[PDB]
Every structure is written in C-alpha cells, then in structure tokens.
Design an enzyme around this catalytic site. Structure first.
Site, short mmCIF file in Angstrom:
data_model
loop_
_atom_site.label_atom_id
_atom_site.label_comp_id
_atom_site.label_asym_id
_atom_site.label_seq_id
_atom_site.Cartn_x
_atom_site.Cartn_y
_atom_site.Cartn_z
N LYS A 10 0.66 -1.57 -0.36
CA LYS A 10 0.03 -0.29 -0.14
C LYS A 10 0.96 1.34 -0.09
CE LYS A 10 -1.96 1.66 3.57
NZ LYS A 10 -1.53 3.50 3.66
N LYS A 15 7.86 1.24 0.28
CA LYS A 15 8.17 0.03 -1.25
C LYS A 15 9.61 1.12 -0.97
CE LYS A 15 4.81 0.82 -2.73
NZ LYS A 15 3.66 1.90 -2.06
N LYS A 41 3.83 8.04 -8.11
CA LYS A 41 4.92 9.63 -8.01
C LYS A 41 6.16 9.73 -7.47
CE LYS A 41 5.17 10.55 -2.25
NZ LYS A 41 7.09 10.16 -1.77
N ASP A 129 -2.94 -0.30 -3.95
CA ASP A 129 -3.70 -0.12 -3.74
C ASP A 129 -4.65 -0.15 -4.20
OD1 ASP A 129 -2.53 2.14 -1.72
OD2 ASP A 129 -1.30 2.81 -3.45
N1 LIG Z 1 12.17 1.62 8.08
C1 LIG Z 1 11.83 2.44 8.37
N2 LIG Z 1 12.37 3.71 9.38
C2 LIG Z 1 11.99 4.59 9.31
N3 LIG Z 1 11.22 5.40 8.26
C3 LIG Z 1 10.58 4.71 7.54
C4 LIG Z 1 11.06 3.50 6.78
N4 LIG Z 1 10.51 2.94 5.62
C5 LIG Z 1 10.26 4.21 5.19
N5 LIG Z 1 10.05 5.07 6.02
C6 LIG Z 1 9.64 6.75 5.86
O1 LIG Z 1 7.96 6.31 5.16
C7 LIG Z 1 8.19 6.98 4.60
C8 LIG Z 1 7.46 6.27 3.12
O2 LIG Z 1 8.95 5.07 3.31
P1 LIG Z 1 8.13 5.16 1.21
O3 LIG Z 1 9.95 4.07 0.90
O4 LIG Z 1 8.39 6.61 0.16
O5 LIG Z 1 7.32 4.81 0.85
P2 LIG Z 1 5.63 4.39 -0.40
O6 LIG Z 1 7.42 3.60 -1.29
O7 LIG Z 1 5.65 2.76 0.39
O8 LIG Z 1 4.68 4.39 -0.63
C9 LIG Z 1 9.43 7.67 4.09
O9 LIG Z 1 9.10 9.50 4.88
C10 LIG Z 1 10.16 7.01 4.38
O10 LIG Z 1 11.32 8.10 4.61
MG LIG Z 2 6.89 5.24 -3.39
#
Ligand SMILES: Nc1ncnc2c1ncn2[C@@H]1O[C@H](COP(=O)(O)OP(=O)(O)O)[C@@H](O)[C@H]1O
Ligand SMILES: [Mg+2]
Ligand SMILES: Nc1ncnc2c1ncn2[C@@H]1O[C@H](COP(=O)(O)OP(=O)(O)O)[C@@H](O)[C@H]1O
Ligand code: SF4
Ligand code: SF4
Ligand SMILES: [Mg+2]
Lengths: 274, 274
Positions: A10, A15, A41, A129
């Site tokens: 999600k 990811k 994104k 999603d």
């Molecule tokens: N293990 C973790 N510890 C701290 N922050 C995290 C961790 N994994 C992700 N984040 C934070 O969560 C937010 C979303 O992560 P992201 O990889 O961009 O999600 P997605 O790609 O699934 O939308 C980012 O701000 C990222 O820095």
């Molecule tokens: Mg992403």
C-alpha cells in the site's frame, strides 16, 4: 539469467525506501541491479541518483515526440553502486488510467535491450492500492516472477497484501509469477513481527525480514541517499544487508492462499495490536 | 436541496472511520444522511449497520442477473440514526478496473430515485490513492460538490491531498466540484495541526478539524459501532460532533492551488515532523 522481482504494497508503507536500500546493499555485495519505478509518485530512484526524483519515460517521450524517439542510453541513469534507474511516470490525476505509463515503460525497456545478460536483479517498485491496469501488468504479463510485499501490522497494509495475493492467484495458470515473501516495515508495535509471520504462514509464504523503524532513514533521505550510502556502519544498514542476503538466498516462491476478512481480523485480535 | 460531499484520501488514513462518525453525529443532530461506499474494501458502512460489511451493488447485481433487476429498497440499508447505506463494490484484484463499480452504483442510485428531497447530506467515501476511472467519477461527473480530504502529517497523505486537488482543478471548467477542507486525522506528532493548517493555506482551503488519535475508536469498532453510538460521552465523540458542526457551517468551497514537491518538502522540514 536475472531475477525479476517486484515490490508491492500500500501507499506510504515503505516500498521505495526498502527497495532502494535493499538494492544498494545488493550493489555493495557486487550485484548488478536495475530499478524500474512503477508508481506515479515517481520518486522510486531518487536515493540511488542523489536527486529530487527522475524524469519519467512518459515525460521524456512527450518532449521527444514519441517513445520511439527515445534512446535507452538517454533514459536509464546510473547512481550509487552502478545501480541503473528508470521511472515510468503516469498521466496527471483525473486523466486516463493512472497505471498506463507502466505498460509503456516496461515494453520500451524490453524492446530497447535494457535486460542485458549481465544484470543480476531487476526490481519493479509498484503501487499496490489497486491491482489493475498497468499496476497489474507485471503480474498479468509475467514480468516479475518474485513478488515481495511490504506491509506492517496496520490492518490496511495486511489487506493490501491479501489483495495483491489474490491477483497473483488469478494469473497463476500462465507465466510464473509467485509470492516470494512479506517484508514487515515496523510501526514499532508489540508482537508485530509475530503478526506478520502468522499472516505469511496463512498465505503460504514467509516473513523474509522485519525492518525496524529507525530515524536514520529520515536523516539519510533528507540528504537524498540510502542508509547504505549515508552511514554504512548504521544498525539499519545491517538490517538492509540482512534483507538483501535473504532475498538472494530465497527459494520459496508460492501460489499464495488468500485469506478471509475474518481471518485478518482474528490475527489482529489475537496479537493484541488493536 | 441536499449537500453532496465526498471524503477522499490515501488508503488507511481514516476515511471510513471519520465519515461514519461524522455522519452519526449529523444524524444525532437530526440530519438525514446517505453514505455511498466508493472504495473496493467495501467496509465503509459497517459501523452504521453494526455489521461485518455490506453486500455490494456489484455482488447483488450479479446474483440478480443485471443491475436493473435490483430494487432500491433491496439495496439501501438503514442503521444508526436512520442513516442509509450502500456499497459500490468492485472487480476482484487483477481483473478489470478497480473503480468500475463506483460508476454502476452512482448511476443506479440516481436512476432509482435514491436522492429523495428529504436527504440533507450524501457522503461518498472514495479511494484516493489513484484519481482515475470510477474513483475520479464523483469529480469528473459533478456528483460531489464538496470534497473533504482526510490526511495527516505523513508525507504520503499530503501527497495524496495534493493529487486529489489536481483532479479537482482539472475539472473546474464544468460542474461545481470544489475542495471544502482538509481533515487532519492525527498521528500524535508534534506541530501536526500547524502542518496541516499550513498545507491547507497553500492549497487555498482550511483545516476544518483536527481529529485526535484515540483508542476509543478501536474499542468502538471491535463492537461494530461509531464512537457516537458506542460511548456518546467520550471525548472523541465530542471531536466528531465538532467536525460535523463545522461541515454543516462551512461555506468555503474553492478551486484549489496544487503545490510543488519542493513546497511539500519545505512544509515537512519547517514543522520538524521529519
Ligand atoms: N524502516 C523505516 N524507518 C523509518 N522511516 C521509514 C522506514 N521505511 C520507510 N520510512 C519512511 O516512510 C515514508 C514512506 O516510505 P516510502 O518508501 O516512500 O513508501 P512508498 O514507496 O511505499 O509510498 C518515507 O518518509 C520513509 O522515509
Ligand atoms: Mg514509493
Ligand atoms: N482518530 C483515530 N484514532 C484512532 N484510530 C483511528 C482513528 N481514525 C482511524 N483509526 C483507525 O485507522 C484504521 C483505518 O481507518 P479507516 O477509516 O478504515 O481508513 P480508510 O477508510 O481511509 O482506509 C482503522 O483501524 C481505524 O480504526
Ligand atoms: S482504477 Fe485507475 S483507471 Fe481503473
Ligand atoms: S489504475 Fe485501475 S484500471 Fe486504471
Ligand atoms: Mg475505508
């Protein structure tokens, strides 16, 4: 040969952070990797490229005329560890189908010879999603044989994992797309590791790694890097190295067993997360 | 007249909890309300109906033959406070377009006379991770004039709010779909209220309410109720009553001003959330 993997889950679950850090660890090991961003994104490669983001194939094709006026050497960009990076892009909100750029991008990469024999891994970072249009294409069209789902003890994240698993089951009569594992990206809640292990066992897979919540991620990402590059000595760097090792060694690739909403609710009730 | 409102936002942000509690508060006031579920998760009415979920128009039409063999009196269900409830449904993962059921449902409700003059409000609870297909239809086809976006200090939730706003802008030449406000569903982080106020001001709207994070929500939902019904004396019940009052009184409906990724990142940097 090369292992084609897709990271689903999600929105906001982790990811892109998990994929880029995992891939940086693979490159640190000496693997050759490509990341293909399949999320509108379009920031799935910024930590490898030290960048704001990366201009997308849909954007570049529009400026060039057609996608055929693009050259692979103009589109792929290399960053940390020699990791090669590309972004699909997608139409603006309210216009078209949000996933249509994924189809254009993967087809372009295949036609133009991006899948060179020297690659060891390709990772697709896919919005999860909804499982439809171009977001379903890596599964429907047999592009990613190994699906790893990032999730957490959040009910919505587990629901997404179940829905992605239903998509894998739907296309299991053709191709070879399989569920390779769940990756728990921790919310710092008690028994969360046990919860995702239990969910994985019900689906027929495994929890390949429990990624702790660690603020070093934010400090690295403010500086446009993976933790692997930002602080190779960080505890969290070793976490991503453990995840990378287990992905390399993983041989369990299954047709999953999606569960009912009652099963999901019982998981949450049992492990006291709610 | 009746006010047609849609609640959008990223998955798991709190759309269904916020909508059902807001609507319960409206019914407690004496308003007549319909909820139309426009999320494939299809649990947007369970807290009004005291139910697991609700069978969807797509499911019911398949069992009846066609959607025209369905009767409105067989589809709409009334729960707490007389609130009327319906779920759109959607195709299974990997099949079709995830939003196609929303189009079928809204058209059925319009044709069959569900929008009776005695209703005061209709709320659509809409998946917002992509703005396309049936999920864009309430905006594209002028079904929901007042859009309220549930979000939080989470970067992904603010990105979703910006993307939904871009969809509103795209269709502003026709119809009368407008952004009515942001609803902050708290992550219990410092300065989060200030952050969402700032985001709202950049978009040209307002933070209509800051909803605290409160475990009474989980205790009510385990029992399949809104907090309004479960514990009318709860502090969180009064929070939902304040949100309901401000929605009733709101007169600011704008064509929003979507912001750049640099603006979003500056917001996060400034208010120290990251
Ligand atoms: N293990 C973790 N510890 C701290 N922050 C995290 C961790 N994994 C992700 N984040 C934070 O969560 C937010 C979303 O992560 P992201 O990889 O961009 O999600 P997605 O790609 O699934 O939308 C980012 O701000 C990222 O820095
Ligand atoms: Mg992403
Ligand atoms: N203000 C709140 N306080 C505590 N828990 C909340 C609050 N709002 C939502 N939740 C919880 O968050 C989870 C997701 O909310 P939900 O409304 O289902 O999200 P969405 O409909 O946007 O996917 C649910 O478990 C819900 O109980
Ligand atoms: S969900 Fe997006 S276009 Fe079908
Ligand atoms: S995104 Fe779902 S079908 Fe177009
Ligand atoms: Mg919901």
């Amino acid at each position: 040969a090369m292992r084609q993997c897709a990271i689903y889950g999600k929105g906001g679950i982790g990811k892109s952070t998990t994929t880029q850090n995992l891939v940086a660890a693979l490159a640190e090991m000496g693997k050759k990797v490509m990341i293909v961003g399949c999320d509108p994104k379009a920031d799935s490669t910024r930590l490898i490229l030290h960048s704001k983001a990366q201009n997308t194939i849909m954007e570049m094709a529009a400026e060039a005329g057609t996608v055929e006026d693009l050259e692979l050497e103009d589109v792929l960009k290399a960053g940390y560890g020699g990791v090669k990076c590309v972004e699909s892009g997608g139409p603006e909100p309210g216009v078209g189908c949000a996933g249509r750029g994924v189809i254009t991008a993967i087809n372009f990469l295949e036609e133009e010879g991006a899948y060179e024999d020297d690659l060891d891994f390709v990772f697709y970072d896919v919005l999860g999603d909804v499982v439809c249009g171009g977001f379903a294409m890596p599964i429907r069209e047999n592009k990613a044989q190994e699906i790893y789902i990032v999730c957490s003890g959040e009910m919505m994240a587990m629901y997404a994992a179940n829905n992605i698993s239903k998509g894998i089951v739907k296309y299991a009569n053709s191709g070879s797309v399989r569920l390779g594992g769940l990756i728990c990206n921790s919310r710092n809640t008690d028994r969360e590791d046990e919860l995702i292990i239990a969910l994985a066992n019900k689906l027929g897979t495994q929890m390949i790694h429990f990624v702790p919540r660690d603020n070093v991620v934010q400090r690295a990402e403010i500086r446009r890097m993976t933790v692997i590059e930002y602080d190779p000595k960080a505890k969290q760097a070793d976490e991503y190295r453990a995840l990378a090792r287990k992905v390399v060694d993983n041989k369990l690739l299954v047709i999953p067993n999606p569960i009912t909403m009652d099963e999901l609710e019982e998981l949450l009730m049992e492990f006291g997360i709610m």
